[PDB]
Design a protein around this ligand. Structure first.
Ligand SMILES: Nc1ncc(Cc2ccc(Br)cc2)s1
Ligand SMILES: Nc1ncc(Cc2ccc(Br)cc2)s1
Ligand SMILES: [Mg+2]
Ligand SMILES: [Mg+2]
Lengths: 546, 546
């Protein structure tokens, strides 16, 4: 029956309500109870506050009208306002104190996910204060999670006028009885109730959510912890930079603040960072999530040596040159992790800080060919299978959906070992035709990867593994250096290839290294433990890169 | 005969030379003359400094080797180093003091423009200091102006070893006698001279440039002031954001720091900002230069109302939402200028600061239809011609090259008046078939616009003028507001349509308005007076938007 959910902002989606601050301010300054709420509301539908809420004047123009109203309420009440009474000061503090009320937001999210149309309906203002950015961020953060945001100052109408409710029903393309509306103000519910909407008077959050869960029949309270926000590819800003004449790099870009360049591994995509991108942007960074060379919408030339670490690094440098970035933070996973360490080694001046998920930094051994070194570890046998051009391509492109569904699995869901792949003659020889869907990924997400890899397949991606000797020779030039810029190594407990112990000597080469560690996390770290990744990165960025 | 020009960095392209700082430091601290230059150079080809310059160790690893060398030189000289002697401190100060030597850079530029291949050859280091970004910026700024930058620490070789010169001749694909090389160190010229290169020992800049002008036969000294750096479209990062399902916006993106969104007028392009984009990026901003809706690589739907100011503003807001920007600085010219004022009026919270070139802010007259208002000014007659769908399209698309060559002209070069266009029956009725090339633009630049407008022609662009009534109605909602965020108005003296006096009452509506004014500047402000525009914007940004 209920198909729409509408949330007030002040006192419902954002807390403390700013009305509650007029309460406290009165008491703090020992004024008459309600004097500040009277001056606020003076003149009703024709008073300063209604003109503000309808968008007729800006917040800076209203401030001095509210001052006047305070002089007038105080005179008629026979008190005096304190010396240094400041309306600007009180509202600056009140607006900056209000935050997103997390459990209401997650209830709105969850209803959106069970198919509800959702909106925010709020009486708000055109904010032109020096400090307006604070509110602009808050509204951006809430708004990406709703179908609509209706603002009184944008539509020229206010709660509780009956016209804004009709504009609501009309925006939602629904009838009064298919809508629930939560607001902390009884007067605003009054007209929604008249048209026959379910309403919930919002006092404490939990009681409201209990009423909401009862009326919608969907569980909202005590729900398990939700995943971080993901990205819809077609909602993103897509960037293209030609780094040399046959080669363009594609990236997805979100946020402002210090540049953070995310570098995925094999065989992945910018999209492997889908759970990090909104969180890092929201934490105050400019995220640039790459399609690395060979992948997705970046170019994929066929030659093996277009993919040695040297050319790849030089090209990531050019990428920064053309974008006008003197530095970025480099964060990599798997092959990306390898590349960011070498960015730190050869271009420290372009690298603000470096982090790797799973991939340790282990200096080249100048007295052993890197092929022998790879033979010394049975878990790396899949790299030998990758060597011969064509063979792995034929297997991995033969069935894309099967390929990614087999690969992208949590640590208890495995359907292949990395074990004597050469001898068995294939990566998938004894694995299912139609693997079951891992709990980590939806069918839709697999199909995004499948669609990416239809552009260029696995040649360019496998070539990252076909420059052992050339990479070894380059790396040997760096064997006198140390990494002395800020650096983070994150190990994954149940990565059975890139195991945590392989990182154990890293401090010899990176004496100030910081570490995170994630338990119960396989190889696909970002989508296995997104919440934990987000927390470790954001904390390390705020302390080391900011 | 000479086909290549090679510039040293320290003491040639950047000044003061850091070698000169060892001089001063010795005197400042009253040490033995040359003690600091001896410790620096200790051990020759096998000493700490050569390993640094070849890239074997990083700058942070060398610092304490130089300390040791200072202890050793001081002991053998029988002096003591001051308490608080700090190698890090001295080099931090010396590196931050060195700047681009402007006249050498402009000589290199000019030689590049007369067809020379140019490079920087420098002994430099892998800089991993906390403060490394300072140097990274400098190198980025120089490097975009040369064919090559060869760094000793990247190639594993140093001046004056003869191997780096061979690597030079080889990178330049030229023979020893087709090359001039300037360096402040005689020893480095010595081997270039042996292979038969022209060399110039660089002491004071002017004497060197005189020698360079003599040997190349190109005038370099006392040249007229050069234009600011322009943009090559295929060297830029190109951004795409879908703001609703039929509509994507394209932009070109350069720089980091606060977001600055540039909004061109009719009938133009992101490229109309080509002279502002590198300067604003270099000044510390993140520039986003739009193709506005209707143009270039942005979508151009056919319907007139897709182009009213309201829809356009809402869509620029969505553009910020998807990019993750809570604010940007909005800078507009002509129609763009109009749009940014309305951004300031209706979305102050998303606008960090607003500037307009030429377009004044003049509030809608609620008692006069805007068509009558347009009839009241004979210089706006071209807007009436624009009204009827098809008529202006047919004229302006008929010959693109003629169209832009006729339009894009300096104030003394006019070939059309905006005067009784309707009566004459065309904008170009009495103008040349093949206009001469204005001094403002090259043939190549016109052809860029021509190629842009082949994608969608003039429908979407003209539609910006076909919403007079709808724009008027929207604007009337704002007639109680003021613009109280930081705002700049720049007038152009010889814009005969958007004349400076039309801006004269702006302070009534924008009481804190700042102003620039550009003399001898027609309608095409950015390309008419780029140097002056850059200076007025950058100064206003640094004081009001930063
Ligand atoms: N646990 C793991 N560590 C590393 C892995 C890399 C890998 C990815 C794809 C193919 Br096909 C084979 C191996 S999987
Ligand atoms: N001096 C000027 N002010 C405004 C101008 C706008 C304009 C641009 C293109 C065509 Br076609 C006609 C007029 S030209
Ligand atoms: Mg409320
Ligand atoms: Mg020098």
């Amino acid at each position: 029956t209920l198909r729409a959910a509408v949330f007030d902002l002040d006192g419902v989606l954002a807390l403390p309500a700013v009305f509650g601050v007029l309460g406290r301010t009165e008491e703090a300054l020992a004024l008459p109870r309600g004097l500040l709420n009277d001056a606020f509301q003076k003149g009703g539908p024709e008073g300063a506050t209604t003109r503000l809420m309808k968008g007729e004047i800006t917040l800076s123009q209203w401030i001095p009208l509210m001052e006047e109203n305070c002089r007038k309420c105080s005179e008629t009440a026979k008190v005096c306002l304190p010396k240094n009474f400041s309306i600007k000061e009180i509202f600056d503090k009140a607006i900056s104190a209000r935050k997103i009320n997390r459990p209401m937001l997650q209830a709105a999210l969850m209803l959106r996910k069970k198919g509800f149309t959702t909106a925010i309906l709020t009486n708000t203002w055109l904010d032109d204060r020096a400090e307006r950015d604070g509110l602009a961020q808050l509204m951006c953060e809430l708004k990406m999670h709703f179908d609509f945001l209706i603002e009184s100052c944008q539509v020229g109408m206010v709660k509780p006028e009956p016209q804004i409710y009709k504009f609501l029903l009309d925006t939602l393309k629904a009838s009064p009885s298919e809508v629930v509306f939560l607001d902390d103000i009884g007067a605003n519910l009054k007209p929604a109730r008249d048209l026959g909407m379910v309403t919930i008077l919002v006092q404490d959050t939990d009681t409201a959510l209990k009423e909401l869960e009862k009326v919608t029949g969907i569980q909202l309270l005590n729900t398990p912890a939700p995943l971080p926000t993901s990205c819809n590819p077609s909602d993103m800003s897509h960037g293209y930079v030609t780094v040399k004449p046959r080669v363009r790099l594609h990236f997805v870009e979100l946020g402002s603040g210090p540049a953070v360049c995310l570098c995925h591994g094999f065989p992945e995509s910018w999209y492997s960072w889908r759970y990090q991108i909104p969180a890092l942007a929201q934490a105050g960074y400019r995220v640039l999530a790459m399609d690395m060379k060979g992948y997705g919408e970046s170019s994929a030339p066929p030659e093996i040596e277009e993919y040695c670490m040297e050319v790849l690094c030089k090209e990531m440098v050019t990428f920064l040159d053309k974008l006008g970035l003197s530095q970025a933070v480099f964060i990599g996973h798997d092959w990306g992790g390898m590349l960011v360490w070498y960015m730190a080694l050869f271009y420290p001046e372009r690298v603000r800080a470096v982090a790797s998920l799973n991939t340790p930094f282990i200096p080249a051994n100048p007295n052993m060919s890197p092929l022998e070194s790879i033979k010394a570890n049975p878990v790396f046998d899949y790299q030998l299978y990758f060597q011969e051009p064509g063979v792995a391509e034929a297997e991995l492109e033969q069935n894309l959906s099967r390929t990614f569904k087999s690969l992208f699995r949590a640590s208890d869901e495995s359907v292949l070992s990395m074990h004597k792949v050469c001898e068995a003659g294939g990566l998938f020889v004894n694995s299912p035709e139609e693997p079951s869907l891992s709990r980590m990924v939806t069918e839709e997400e697999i199909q995004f990867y499948v669609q990416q890899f239809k552009k260029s397949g696995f040649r360019g991606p496998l070539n990252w593994y076909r420059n052992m000797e050339r990479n070894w020779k380059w790396a040997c030039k760096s064997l006198g250096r140390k990494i002395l810029i800020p650096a983070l190594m994150v190990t994954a407990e149940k990565d059975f290839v890139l195991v945590p112990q392989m990182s154990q000597h890293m401090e010899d080469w990176i004496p100030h290294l910081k570490r995170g560690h994630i338990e119960d996390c396989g190889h696909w770290t970002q989508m296995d433990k997104p919440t934990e990744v987000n927390q470790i990165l954001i904390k390390w960025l705020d302390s080391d890169a900011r």
